[PDB]
């Protein structure tokens, strides 16, 4: 009367599993707005110094937007690529000075650079009709650094929340967390849209970042536990693919409404509405069984059978773990680093996450020039993931999990190396090769997440994935400084670093025990001899 066998008898993937997965997938998209980052909310458009006098002249004679930029603004390319033009204002009187459209400012100085440069007051004038966080508080020229501070604060919030949310998640149940985390994320999201100052915006975004990844991972583990042992691949990969669909939909709606306030206020509400379906999914049976709450576990199991409609097995009356466990099974950080096998697994998974994140950021950084339409570029970058799902979805159970993960982790680094060595000049090849690397990295991410979820004990499964995921955000934070510094020493030093990181990670993956078609562990001692 073990949990897995009774689950087989009552249907591994029945109509109950489909409904629960539909709801959790509806939750999946809610993580796209918080994960997409500052983009679509802090895009910096073209900007020049507003002048009062230009407004008068603009109507007097025929004008064009391109023409106004050229001979009304200070020229670019002096003492910097575009530092003068962006936020420097000549401050020559354009009002009550009728010098004709042909020669508005030429006559006075007989030269441009020598002209007198004043302060860039009167705020700024922006190109795009929409408004972003940059346009709101004028964080353009003097305070430009503030945007980087905002991004770094969000990332450090991710990093802290990764560690923090795990313990509150596993000790107090997987549905007490998913409910509270998504509720806090929703309330922070709407509260943000009414932020009048810059401090409140940062604080609310920090809270949302703290809670979002916890919500997403507690949603992931729940379905992974619910589904049968054999059908884990479909549930996990379709969860990731739902996340990708949510990303595409976010790009679409972002192009729909440019304004940041309305964008946030609209995209956040569906996460709040998801709360309306909290009553659909109950607590995971395995967690309850491991906590010694057997009556609730059997009650939940009977409900699954009733909705699925096959039959209730009479053996449930004696449902319990394989071996008579101890009264208390509290999750703690100390228990994570006791068994040598579990310690080795944790170290290997941490390194895997770190290398995956570093290689991803290196690839995106080393990409080609950005396209004219940011939205179209983001749409393509999201769409490049769909074939990854249909590649992985058919290979896991047929070939196992270690080999594809290792081979993709190797091929991503190989593609980075070939891009470094082979000509990087504008050609049709390079874009497609980069797409190959993108698909490799996406496969690595999804496979690492799945294997890490499957490898840990059930009673601390969430904590393990949280800890091993923190290094992902750590690497994402640190990589830009590393690549900037290394470039100074040698032109190609960062590329060698990325390639060696990828190769070493791919080599080290092989030692991780395989999990093809084996019931996920429920006891740390049992997980220790998983390979045996
Ligand atoms: C761009 O600005 C420059 C300003 O230098 C314009 O080109 C010349 O500007 C000098 C300075 O006033 C004039 O003496 C020349 O007569 C300008 N060129 C010509 C062909 O007359 C230029 O016209 C501006 N851009 C456009 C599209 O006209």
> Exposure of 356 by Cβ count < 10 A (0-12 exposed, 13-18 middle, 19+ buried)?
buried
Q: How far apart are CA 395 and CA 509, in angstroms?
A: 18
The structure tokens 């770190």 sit at 354
The structure tokens 């802090």 sit at 42
Q: Whose C-alpha lies nearest to ligand 1, atom 5? A: 71
Q: Whose C-alpha lies nearest to ligand 1, atom 26? A: 67
Q: Whose C-alpha lies nearest to ligand 1, atom 28? A: 67
State in Å: Cα 102 to ligand 1 middle.
9
Query: C-alpha distances in angstroms, 262 versus 36, 130, 255, 360, 397?
Result: 17, 11, 12, 31, 44
Q: How far apart are CA 402 and CA 410, in angstroms?
A: 12
Residue 399: which residues within 8 A CB-CB, separation 6 or more?
Answer: none
| Number of residues in the chain | 532
State in Å: Cα 150 to ligand 1 middle.
41
Q: Is residue 239 within 8 Å of residue 110, measured between CB atoms?
A: no
Q: How far apart are CA 524 and CA 321, in angstroms?
A: 13
Q: How far apart are the first and last CA of the chain?
A: 24
Of 200, 204, 44, whose CA–CA distance to 133 is shortest? Answer: 44
**308 in any annotated domain:** yes
DSSP H or E stretch at residue 468? helix 461-489
> Exposure of 167 by Cβ count < 10 A (0-12 exposed, 13-18 middle, 19+ buried)?
middle
Domain count, the chain: 1
Return the residues preceding each gap in the chain, C–N over 2.5 A, or none: none
Q: Which atom of ligand 1 is the closest one to the Cα of 70?
A: 1
> Exposure of 77 by Cβ count < 10 A (0-12 exposed, 13-18 middle, 19+ buried)?
exposed
Q: How far apart are CA 290 and CA 288, in angstroms?
A: 5
Residue 138: which residues within 8 A CB-CB, separation 6 or more?
Answer: 123, 124
Of 386, 122, 340, whose CA–CA distance to 248 is shortest? Answer: 386
Q: How far apart are CA 405 and CA 523, in angstroms?
A: 26
Of 68, 64, 193, whose CA–CA distance to 133 is shortest? Answer: 193
Q: Which two tokens stand for residue 498?
A: 């990325």
Q: Is residue 233 within 8 Å of residue 397, measured between CB atoms?
A: yes
Q: How far apart are CA 357 and CA 348, in angstroms?
A: 14
State in Å: Cα 118 to ligand 1 middle.
23
Q: Whose C-alpha lies nearest to ligand 1, atom 11? A: 106
Q: Whose C-alpha lies nearest to ligand 1, atom 2? A: 71
Rg (CA), the chain: 28
Q: Compute how many other C-beta atoms are within 10 angstroms of the C-beta atom of residue 110.
A: 8
DSSP state of 118: B
Q: Which of 63, 92, 106 to mutate to test the pocket of ligand 1 (most atoms within 8 A of CB)?
A: 106
Q: Whose C-alpha lies nearest to ligand 1, atom 12? A: 106
State in Å: Cα 67 to ligand 1 middle.
10
State in Å: Cα 66 to ligand 1 middle.
13
Of 178, 524, 176, 203, whose CA–CA distance to 332 is shortest? Answer: 524
Q: How far apart are CA 432 and CA 392, in angstroms?
A: 20
**201 in any annotated domain:** yes
Q: How far apart are CA 122 and CA 50, in angstroms?
A: 6
State in Å: Cα 27 to ligand 1 middle.
57
Half-sphere exposure of 460 (CA within 13 A, CB side): 22
Q: Which atom of ligand 1 is the closest one to the Cα of 66?
A: 27
Q: Strand pairing partners for 125?
A: 48
Query: C-alpha distances in angstroms, 127 versus 44, 69, 130, 252, 388?
Result: 10, 11, 9, 21, 37
Q: Is residue 251 within 8 Å of residue 375, measured between CB atoms?
A: yes
Q: Which atom of ligand 1 is the closest one to the Cα of 106?
A: 12
Q: Compute how many other C-beta atoms are within 10 angstroms of the C-beta atom of residue 462.
A: 28
**397 in any annotated domain:** yes
Q: Whose C-alpha lies nearest to ligand 1, atom 3? A: 71
Technique used: cryo-EM
Question: What phi and psi values does residue 206 have, to the nearest 5 degrees?
Answer: -65, -45
> Exposure of 370 by Cβ count < 10 A (0-12 exposed, 13-18 middle, 19+ buried)?
exposed
Q: Which atom of ligand 1 is the closest one to the Cα of 75?
A: 2
Using N-to-C axis directions, what is the helix angle for 386-399 and 428-455, rounded to 10°?
A: 50
CA 513 from chain centre, in angstroms, equals 28
State in Å: Cα 44 to ligand 1 middle.
29
**187 in any annotated domain:** yes
| Three-class secondary structure assignment of 208-254 | HHHHHHHHHHHHHHHHHHHCCCCCHHHHHHHHHHHHHHHHHHHHHHH
Region of 116 (left: φ > 0; alpha: ψ -120 to 50; beta: rest) is beta
Q: Strand pairing partners for 49?
A: 124
CATH code: domain of residue 467: 1.20.1250.20
Q: Is residue 336 within 8 Å of residue 460, measured between CB atoms?
A: yes
Q: Whose C-alpha lies nearest to ligand 1, atom 7? A: 71
Residue 112: which residues within 8 A CB-CB, separation 6 or more?
Answer: 74, 75
Q: Whose C-alpha lies nearest to ligand 1, atom 23? A: 71
Cβ of 106 below 6 Å from ligand 1: yes
Of 175, 376, 382, whose CA–CA distance to 283 is shortest? Answer: 175
Of 315, 240, 190, whose CA–CA distance to 31 is shortest? Answer: 240
Q: Which atom of ligand 1 is the closest one to the Cα of 105?
A: 12
Q: Whose C-alpha lies nearest to ligand 1, atom 21? A: 102
Q: Whose C-alpha lies nearest to ligand 1, atom 8? A: 71
Question: What phi and psi values does residue 210 have, to the nearest 5 degrees?
Answer: -55, -40
Of 447, 27, 14, whose CA–CA distance to 231 is shortest? Answer: 14
Cβ of 71 below 6 Å from ligand 1: yes
DSSP H or E stretch at residue 53? helix 52-60
Q: Is residue 465 within 8 Å of residue 422, measured between CB atoms?
A: no
Q: How far apart are CA 133 and CA 151, in angstroms?
A: 12
Cβ of 99 below 6 Å from ligand 1: no
Q: Whose C-alpha lies nearest to ligand 1, atom 4? A: 71
Q: Which of 61, 68, 71 to mutate to test the pocket of ligand 1 (most atoms within 8 A of CB)?
A: 71
DSSP H or E stretch at residue 126? strand 124-126
DSSP H or E stretch at residue 124? strand 124-126
- Look at the alpha carbons of 341, 342, 347, 353 in this order and tell me if their dihedral is positive or negative: positive
Q: Is residue 213 within 8 Å of residue 30, measured between CB atoms?
A: no
Of 432, 435, 409, whose CA–CA distance to 506 is shortest? Answer: 409
Q: Is residue 339 within 8 Å of residue 524, measured between CB atoms?
A: yes
**84 in any annotated domain:** no
Q: Is residue 122 within 8 Å of residue 82, measured between CB atoms?
A: no
Range of the domain at 295: 3-43+144-529
**83 in any annotated domain:** no
Q: Which atom of ligand 1 is the closest one to the Cα of 103?
A: 12
Q: Whose C-alpha lies nearest to ligand 1, atom 13? A: 106
Residue 349: which residues within 8 A CB-CB, separation 6 or more?
Answer: 448, 451, 452, 455, 464, 468, 512
**77 in any annotated domain:** no
State in Å: Cα 99 to ligand 1 middle.
15
Cβ of 70 below 6 Å from ligand 1: yes
State in Å: Cα 103 to ligand 1 middle.
9
Q: How far apart are CA 117 and CA 90, in angstroms?
A: 4
Cβ of 76 below 6 Å from ligand 1: no
DSSP H or E stretch at residue 47? strand 47-49
The structure tokens 């595409």 sit at 248
- Burial of 378-391, coded b for 16+ CB within 10 Å and e otherwise, reads bbeebebbeebbee
Query: C-alpha distances in angstroms, 335 versus 86, 339, 428, 463, 524?
Result: 56, 8, 52, 11, 9
Of 421, 426, 417, 287, whose CA–CA distance to 359 is shortest? Answer: 417
Q: Strand pairing partners for 124?
A: 49
DSSP state of 86: H
3-state SS assignment for residue 426: coil
Residue 215: which residues within 8 A CB-CB, separation 6 or more?
Answer: 27, 30, 31, 177, 178, 181, 182, 185
**98 in any annotated domain:** no
């Amino acid at each position: 009367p073990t949990v897995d066998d009774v689950l087989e008898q009552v249907g591994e993937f029945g109509w109950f599993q489909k409904q629960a997965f539909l709801t959790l997938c509806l939750l999946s998209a809610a993580f796209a707005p918080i994960y997409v980052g500052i983009v679509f909310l802090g895009f910096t458009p073209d900007h020049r110094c507003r002048s009062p006098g230009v407004a008068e002249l603009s109507q007097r004679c025929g004008w064009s937007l391109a023409e106004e930029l050229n001979y009304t603004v200070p020229g670019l390319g002096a003492a910097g690529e575009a530092f003068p033009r962006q936020c420097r204002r000549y401050e020559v009187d354009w009002n009550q000075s009728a010098l004709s459209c042909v020669d508005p400012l030429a006559s006075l100085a007989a030269n441009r650079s020598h002209l007198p440069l004043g302060p860039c007051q009167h705020g700024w004038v922006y190109d795009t009709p929409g408004s972003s966080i940059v346009t709101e508080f004028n964080l353009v020229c003097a305070d430009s650094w503030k945007v980087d501070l905002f991004q770094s604060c969000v990332n450090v919030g991710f990093f802290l929340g990764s560690l923090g949310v795990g313990y509150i998640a596993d000790r107090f149940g997987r549905k007490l967390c998913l409910l509270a985390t998504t509720l806090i994320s929703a309330v922070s999201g709407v509260l943000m849209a009414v932020a009048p100052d810059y401090t409140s915006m940062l604080l609310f975004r920090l809270l949302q970042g703290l809670v979002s990844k916890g919500s997403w991972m507690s949603g992931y583990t729940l379905i992974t536990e619910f589904v049968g042992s054999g059908y884990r691949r479909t549930v996990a990969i379709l969860y990731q693919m739902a996340f990708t669909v949510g990303l595409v939909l976010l790009s679409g709606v972002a192009y729909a409404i440019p304004h940041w306030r309305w964008l946030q206020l609209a995209v956040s509400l569906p996460t709040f509405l998801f709360l309306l379906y909290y009553w659909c999914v109950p607590e995971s049976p395995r967690w309850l069984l491991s906590q010694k709450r057997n009556t609730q576990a059997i009650k939940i199991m009977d409900h699954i059978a009733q909705k699925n409609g096959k039959l209730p097995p009479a053996d449930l009356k004696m449902l319990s773990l394989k071996e008579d466990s101890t009264e208390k099974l509290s999750p703690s950080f100390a228990d994570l680093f006791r068994t040598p096998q579990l310690r080795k697994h944790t170290f290997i998974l941490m390194y895997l996450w770190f290398t995956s994140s570093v290689l991803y950021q290196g690839l995106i950084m080393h990409m080609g020039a950005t396209g004219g339409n940011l939205y179209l570029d983001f749409f393509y970058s999201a769409l490049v993931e769909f074939p990854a799902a249909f590649i992985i979805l058919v290979t896991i159970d047929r070939v196992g999990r270690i080999y594809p993960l290792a081979v993709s982790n190797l091929v991503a680094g190989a593609a980075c190396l070939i891009m470094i060595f082979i000509s990087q000049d504008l050609h049709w090849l390079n874009i497609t090769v980069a797409c190959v690397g993108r698909m490799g990295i996406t496969i690595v991410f999804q496979m690492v997440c799945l294997v890490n979820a499957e490898l840990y004990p059930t009673f601390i499964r969430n904590l393990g994935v949280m800890v091993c995921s923190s290094l992902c955000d750590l690497g994402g934070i640190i990589t830009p400084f590393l690549v900037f510094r290394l470039m100074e020493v040698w032109q190609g030093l960062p590329l060698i670093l990325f390639t060696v990181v990828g190769l070493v990670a791919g080599g080290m993956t092989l030692l991780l025990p395989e999990t093809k078609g084996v019931a996920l562990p429920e006891t740390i001692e049992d997980a220790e001899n998983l390979g045996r």
